[PDB]
């Protein structure tokens, strides 16, 4: 067998059947004789390639495979990799390298010091020392991406390797099963369970690794047993809990003082599947108030190490959530009562308040819709206004890197063909990965894109106001016609200048057979 | 509180009470006002500092704290860090940096790009962005070193940071408890247990993380239940099993073909706490023979990812070994019978055969002796000839880096004051970290050093023979007087030119009140 | 031809004929069939290997070639590499890697992520992607080490590469000539010359790259023409000027305020071949006083970029010094008058003051002696008391990393067999690379080692006093018998407890046929 044949067999035996890519010369010897059982999903720029693959991996809860073009292709994707790192996305990023005979002279397309290029945004980065090593290196990449804490990995392959003879002993790679599905030993788990049972006023905080693990239902059971309020950890990349469940208390503010104030009076705070904590704004104060102790369950040693307070347990979130939910006592305390309905903001017949948009989406979207958020000034209102009953219903750029949601929404829709994906994206954010629209059109992936057009980088104007920072340049983005951009890439386009038009446009989009972009005229901050 | 006061409080609250170091200018502001409850152990060169700390950590099964002098001090220790990486040794390596005001100009003693210096031999490497961050960074270092898979970490601290005011919120760091004491979920563990119970001819292979976890006794129970032979994984850094137990089969040869041949006919091979596998010599063939399947339990994702065959489970070795030992059925098969006694090699009244030395050590040493090995051509015979009944009885440089055993033997003896440590070190190896002897003398740490003097780099002569490599320079090391070196550093010295003298010297050494070096004249290969 | 044959031919065609090494398994296929025209110099630990090679390179003014054993060997040398980086030493560091077939599994002796290991202390670091690339990679290493600014480089080679067929086109590598012997263009050089000619009170500061370039005599001519005082830049690794020439003003204090004060009243300060500046102690103030402007000529862009003041020119020091010396006008100003003789310190019949030792060395040593300094508390007095008329007469650890002088003195003596080398080394410093003594004995390299024994880390006690730092541990190093250590490694040993004995010992050492160590009892600080 050739290295080419052996590598594709390894991929298929490990459950990989799709290649997300943008091709180049160094990758042609890999992509040739492309297996008939594999799919290739082309995107027009590498931030888009990786964003699509990322959405696909996060929604499918399995690794996604990517193929990029040497250093420049890899480099174009590095902003996307920053998000993937923070979301623990299992991405296998491969890039083609020059033929071994031309690497020394640094021929055009040589990826110099290749393994260092994507650092520090990958768990493992490597270029094999010989062609016959390639299948083994691929095996390492697959497992490194897939083991807790999941994350992106990078493999660079000289293009002449693919046609070389494989080592017959590579067959031992094909069916390897590697598990990190582990939980705290019985003795210490019993101690934890007793602490939870004994708490007088427990609280629960959930992060994105809960949704990644599909631990949502177990966390619901845990919250109901403990009769505990449930918050989502700040800067949330995913939604880990049904947002209209009686215990739900919403998205935590991303500030030190704000969080300790919210947790005041709670004697035990159990954090599951989140960093402690992904703060953003400078909001100095106490990490916790006197009387509150914190216990974190995380899949990531780096998270456990850097928490400024609390105990921690490093384990698989699925295994831990299931064990805790099934072991804790049913508290005799009263179940928390549901948060009240959000207020209806006054809305005239002109430009749309974001609150109006979210209320309308919630009214019209199917109950199993999936939302993506890259409308950076409206996140708090989005979290209050969308009833998300099911797992896998929300994605937001985990490192705050714009250019995620547009392509990721296409990958999510590919992963979940029966769930309508609706990406709510600001006019500023829409540009970073605008060419991803083409992939939706070409493959007829029926994502709906809602562009919130207020003509400005609103979140930055807000932060500038907070800083009392005057005379900041570059905050306005006038003069973008999103319907024309959609037409440019072959996506049906609609405009909504008022509520009547928004309702009409959404009705049309929800009944469409392909992707649709709706440009919404929203109020200026 | 100052950063100095807060950091020492964090260290003591996290169980650290000893600093292994060689001091420099950038470290004086850390070392001043040294707490009266802490010990400082000086060594004269940094390979020695780190080797001592490494032995101490491995034997104590807890992190050891190191303080080195900027880049040059760190650099002098990097060979020692290579061993520590391979042995999963929990080492907190700190180094002083220039004052922040002088870093930009690159004043003398500036550690440039400090965090990159010890890579790739550390789990985490960092320099804090401000003085008030230092305690938090130290907390991260402690936990990163201590979490599975354990390993060395690096923290660089500008010397002006220590006198600055600490953040009062740093108190939340002091008592953090972080656990990685995890094992496979019940459902999948039951599957594993059933596979072991159903095996017709199981075999067990154990690596150093078993001894690190003190899982030895549980592995004995497991082997007795399964009625399975037990091998030690190749290139063994520690001894994970009693070497005269009936199931014990010794050290595996470090070759691909040799290992698959040894495992032939075993249907299930369970590897615990080892890489799969730390081969050395080129010995091509099948990774496993038809009919053999392999299951690896490892604490290290990097090990699980790179195994060329078998399934893997990434979990704590202590928790897994205990669970397996207590869950498996007692097989009705016959218990394996003990390996026969080693042959007595013919010995005249002249220079000592290594076999004679090991037999004599085994005869005379206490049953709870601890051995270290850096006699590179005699390892196989050492493993056959020493009855090591107890955990923590053997150490060998885990990355094959010479200069480990001499200082490590001092750290081990410090960790285990009631167990006689005997380091068996070749004449070549003895030189790498020779100045460590001084620390044994100064602190009266009563390690016994047995120098095997055959005048040559014997293992290299052997490998050259294997390669049929002629005209290799640099293989002979004549003209070293080890008694004089011992005298130079204040250690009692004895010579053994024959068996009578070896017995006399060992009797003297075993009754001595301080460290003793015995130079043994061994046969030339 | 084989890669082995082709690589040794490249080395010899590029002027390399000596390998400094400590061998290991991965290097045996390189070292076998060692060419009869090459020398191999063995040292017993890698800090010693690199120190010896460094002294050899610095004194010979040409690259030195080193061969180390995988990661652990490389790591043991990293403190030595820190000095080599700061001294711009052209060192070609090679290390053996595992066979390509065993790299993936990370067999024992695999150097993981090899090229990152010596960073940031090398100019270039690399592992070739195939065997046939090895000669080209070696060519790159040779030239990278040798081009201005000179420095260490690193090449990792899988051991199976050596026996493979070389590319016949590699012959084009053999005779490549690469020059960086460049100077400022005529127009701008004329501007510089006019500025120097027009200065009313110029001063000159010289650094180690002057001595490396053998630009010393040209700098003497320049100073005589400009009638300018000459200082040596702080933390001096080499001596760039005759120390009894009338213009000489000595070693600058390594402090910001001290230097600007010394330069006050000088309108133009010309710095040649030094960083601006290698300060050490914290001594805040003005970088330059009003009225002083600075112009730096440096071979190193990194130095030019980081200077906090002045203009800079990046060019070859030899070419620039020669051009300036020959272009400037002869000033009608009076030539500076020579510094007065140093005072004779009172000396009784007991332990030696360092001043006495240096005066005695100056009295007894040949006029072409070469000194090395690792007596850290006595540097200022050494610089005042040794008349060093010739180039290449002084070396001091350029990054302040101890363990340099003892091995470097052996390399310098090998480079300069007709010039008596005298290394003055503190009792503390002597231990870092003590085993280097063996190389001097084995190859009969007649270096004289003068150990200044005061029982303490004196420079650290001094700095602690400056910090008013109390209760610092680890500052005393009692109980070392240096005569016994010398005997241990086969070097003739003498002791000097008083001046009479010092004179007798020096007379004996200067007439000896081999290396000699003199242990001098010096006064305690
Ligand atoms: C790749 C990238 N570039 C720039 C930013 C900075 N940025 C920017 C430019 C924001 C404004 C986005 O504007 P929008 O139109 O998408 O949404 P809002 O008007 O609701 O803020 S929010 C923010 O953090 C970023 N996060 N990521
Ligand atoms: C730091 C370092 N340098 C060099 C080596 C190479 N090496 C060397 C030099 C060996 C010979 C050791 O000789 P010895 O006298 O200690 O023992 P034997 O004579 O029994 O081999 S074994 C080996 O791998 C190494 N492993 N580590
Ligand atoms: C590799 C390394 N380790 C530690 C130091 C710290 N250090 C040390 C330990 C000094 C004392 C040297 O003592 P000495 O006996 O050689 O000389 P003095 O007594 O004259 O200071 S000076 C100094 O910077 C260093 N520079 N380099
Ligand atoms: Ca906007
Ligand atoms: Ca030997
Ligand atoms: Ca001293
Ligand atoms: Mg258990
Ligand atoms: Mg699907
Ligand atoms: Mg490094
Ligand atoms: Mg379970
Ligand atoms: Mg103890
Ligand atoms: Mg010109
Ligand atoms: Mg010469």
Curated annotation (Swiss-Prot), chains A, B, C:
Pfam families: TPP_enzyme_C (PF02775), TPP_enzyme_M (PF00205), TPP_enzyme_N (PF02776). Pathway: Aromatic compound metabolism; (R)-mandelate degradation; benzoate from (R)-mandelate: step 3/4. Transmembrane segments: none annotated. Ca(2+) binds at residues 427, 454, 456. GO terms for biological process: mandelate catabolic process. PROSITE patterns: TPP_ENZYMES (PS00187). The keyword Metal-binding applies. It comes from the Bacteria. Residues 376-459 are annotated as: Thiamine pyrophosphate binding. Homotetramer. This is Benzoylformate decarboxylase. It comes from Pseudomonas putida.
């Amino acid at each position: 067998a050739s290295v080419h044949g052996t590598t594709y067999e390894l991929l298929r035996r490990q459950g990989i059947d799709t290649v997300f890519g943008n091709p180049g010369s160094n990758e042609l010897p890999f992509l040739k004789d492309f297996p008939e059982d594999f799919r290739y999903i082309l995107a027009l720029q590498e931030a888009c390639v990786v964003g699509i693959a990322d959405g696909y991996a996060q929604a499918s809860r399995k690794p996604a495979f990517i193929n990029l073009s040497s250093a420049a292709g890899t480099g174009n994707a590095m902003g996307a990799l920053s998000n993937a790192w923070n979301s623990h996305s299992p991405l296998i990023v491969t890039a083609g390298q020059q033929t071994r005979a031309m690497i020394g002279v640094e021929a055009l397309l040589t990826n110099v010091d290749a393994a260092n290029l994507p650092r520090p945004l990958v768990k493992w980065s490597y270029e094999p020392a010989s062609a016959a090593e390639v299948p083994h290196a691929m095996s390492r990449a697959i497992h490194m991406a897939s083991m807790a804490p999941q994350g992106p990995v990078y493999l660079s392959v000289p293009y002449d390797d693919w046609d070389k003879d494989a080592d017959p002993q590579s067959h031992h790679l094909f069916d390897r099963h590697v598990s990190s599905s582990v939980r705290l030993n019985d003795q210490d788990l019993d101690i934890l369970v007793k602490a939870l049972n004994s708490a007088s006023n427990p609280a629960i905080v959930l992060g994105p690794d809960v949704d990644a693990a599909n631990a949502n239902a177990d966390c619901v059971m845990l919250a109901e047993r403990l009769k505990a309020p449930v918050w989502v950890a700040p800067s949330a990349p995913r939604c880990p809990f049904p947002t209209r469940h009686p215990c739900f208390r919403g998205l935590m503010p991303a500030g030190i003082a704000a969080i300790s104030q919210l947790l005041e009076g709670h004697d035990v705070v159990l954090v599951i599947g989140a960093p402690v904590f992904r703060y953003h704004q400078y909001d100095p104060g106490q990490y916790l108030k006197p009387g509150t102790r914190l216990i974190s369950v995380t899949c990531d040693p780096l998270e456990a190490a850097r928490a400024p307070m609390g105990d921690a347990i490093v384990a698989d979130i699925g295994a831990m959530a299931s064990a805790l939910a099934n072991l804790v006592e049913e508290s005799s305390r009263q179940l928390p009562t549901a948060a009240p309905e959000p207020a209806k903001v006054d809305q005239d017949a002109g430009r749309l308040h974001p609150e109006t948009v979210f209320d309308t989406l919630n009214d019209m979207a199917p109950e199993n819709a999936i939302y993506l958020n890259e409308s950076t000034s409206t996140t708090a209102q989005m979290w209050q206004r969308l009833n998300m009953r099911n797992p896998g219903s929300y994605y937001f750029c985990a490192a705050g890197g714009l250019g995620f949601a547009l392509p990721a929404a296409i990958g999510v829709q590919l992963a979940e063909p029966e769930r309508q994906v609706i990406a709510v994206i600001g006019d500023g954010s829409a540009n970073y990965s605008i060419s991803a629209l083409w992939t939706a059109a070409q493959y007829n992936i029926p994502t709906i894109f809602v562009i919130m057009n207020n003509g400005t980088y609103g979140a930055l104007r807000w932060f500038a106001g907070v800083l009392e920072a005057e005379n900041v340049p570059g905050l306005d983005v006038p003069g973008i016609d999103f319907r024309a951009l959609a037409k440019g890439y072959g996506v049906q386009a609609l405009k909504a200048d008022n509520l009547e038009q928004l309702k009409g446009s959404l009705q049309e989009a929800l009944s469409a057979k392909g992707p649709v972009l709706i440009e919404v005229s929203t109020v200026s901050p």
